[PDB]
Amino acid sequence: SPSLIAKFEKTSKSNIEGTIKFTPANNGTVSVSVDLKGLPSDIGPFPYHVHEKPVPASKNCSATENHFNPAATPAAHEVGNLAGKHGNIMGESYKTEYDDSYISLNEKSRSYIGGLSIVIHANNGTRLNCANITLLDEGHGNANTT
Ligand SMILES: [Cu+]
Asked: What H or E segment, with its residue span, contains residue 51?
């Protein structure tokens, strides 16, 4: 299944910028790479989750609606609750890599995260920035390059 990326951009609403990248891993897991800067540290730590609807053109993070949620152990967390399972983002800059065995890159899979969104929150729940989850590579198919 194809890899995905969420690209966060700085605006008057937020200085958070960088990427979260999702690549398929061998043992039924997805490799997640987070590379973010510009975080407002003193209002963190920062939960982040996959939400159920796209970020619209207005960049209103509230319009992504709720968590993609289709605890004392990782599987008991919401699927989209990346932060609950793997750690809140924290600091002014944050770079980390981990495997998640609950999200899916398979179009035909129920836990597919393509076409959804990620929201980064302040610790109090306020939504700070958000990005759509889109294809990481432009060229696909078994006779193509990229
Ligand atoms: Cu969220």
From this structure: strand 48-51
Nominal resolution (angstroms): 1.4
Give yes or no for a contact between 77 and 84, defined as CB atoms under 8 angstroms apart. yes
What are the beta bridge partners of residue 94? 36
Distance (angstroms) between ligand 1 centre and the Cα of 87 equals 13
Q: How far is the CA of 24 from the centre of ligand 1 (A)?
A: 23
Residues with CB under 5 A from ligand 1 (ion): 49, 119
Hey, what domains does the chain have and what are their CATH numbers? 1-146 (2.60.40.200)
Is 121 assigned to a binding site? yes
Q: Rounded to a whole number, what is the largest CA-CA distance in the chain?
A: 49
